[PDB]
């Protein structure tokens, strides 16, 4: 199970490292949980629609969302983090 960040999602994760470590911890918990149970668990996961269909979202806080997609089958999967800051 690989963890994949984009340029922008890693930048915002770094931003949290620089400004609020509590948010970093929440995001790490969301990651841990989504790798285990992609569609259930922490942060009230909900599927996005339209051009973001395959993507899912969980709450970090009311103002900040963790958007991701788990891809791959069986034993070689990946979680792609698309956003970890702001609304969708």
Task: List the catalytic residues.
Answer: 46, 87
Q: Is 10 in the site for a copy of itself (CB under 8 A)?
A: yes
Q: Is 40 in the site for a copy of itself (CB under 8 A)?
A: no
The CA distance from 59 to 87, in Å, is 9
Q: Segment contacting a copy of itself (CB under 8 A): 23-31, 47-55, 57-65, 67-75?
A: 23-31
Phi and psi at 80, nearest 5°, equal: -105, 120
Tokens 């103002």 correspond to what residue? 63
For residue 86, what is the DSSP state?
Answer: S
Paired tokens of 68: 């991701």
Q: Is 20 in the site for a copy of itself (CB under 8 A)?
A: no
Query: Where do contacts with a copy of itself occur on this chain (CB under 8 A)?
Result: 1-7, 10, 14, 17, 24, 28, 31, 78
């Amino acid at each position: 199970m690989k963890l994949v960040w984009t340029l922008s999602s890693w930048d915002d994760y770094e931003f949290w490292q620089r400004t609020d470590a509590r948010m970093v911890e929440k995001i790490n918990d969301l990651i841990r949980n989504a790798k285990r149970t992609p569609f259930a668990g922490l942060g009230k996961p909900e599927p996005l629609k339209g051009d973001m269909a395959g993507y899912w979202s969980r709450r970090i806080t009311a103002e900040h969302r963790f958007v991701y997609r788990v891809s791959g089958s069986g034993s070689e999967q990946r979680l792609e983090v698309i956003q970890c800051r702001f609304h969708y």
